[PDB]
């Protein structure tokens with residue numbers, strides 16, 4: 001399924017080239033511009049664990065998740081991955097635990113040492 005495909009066929013978008021964050025562009029976005037550090041970004045997402053369980057979705061909340069890019073307000077894989085996206089893009093992102101919640105996990109939904117899968121849609125970005 002989609003997690004296996006990004007695992008086996010995704011692009012390594014880490015600067016270290018350690019394959020800790022893998023990406024496939026699923027829906028091509030607009031033009032060439034990507035957000036800059038500090039921009040307010042608006043995203044919809046769904047996340048799954050490697051046991052197949054859906055652990056969260058912003059779609060189910062009827063409002064986007066909003067954060068300031070490149071500030072550590074999200075797991076590392078998201079700062080890295082969202083920075084590569086165009087407006088309107090949908091991607092799949094595979095996040096090894098060193099770019100996610102590590103050995104600690106996040107109680108109650110994320111176990112220790114968890115590889116995470118996301119589908120992410122970049123709705124908009126703006127400077128403040």
Ligand SMILES: COC[C@H]1CN([C@@H](C)c2ccccn2)C(=O)[C@@H]2CCC[C@H]1N2S(=O)(=O)c1ccc2ncsc2c1
Nearest residue numbers: 045047055056065073074075078106107108109110116
């Ligand atoms: C509703 O969750 C919003 C947010 C959570 N976080 C950060 C901000 C975070 C904040 C606090 C504790 C754990 N993680 C994150 O960095 C990442 C990436 C952005 C989207 C979400 N997550 S997440 O991985 O989907 C996530 C993680 C744990 C969790 N527990 C209940 S819903 C949920 C969603």
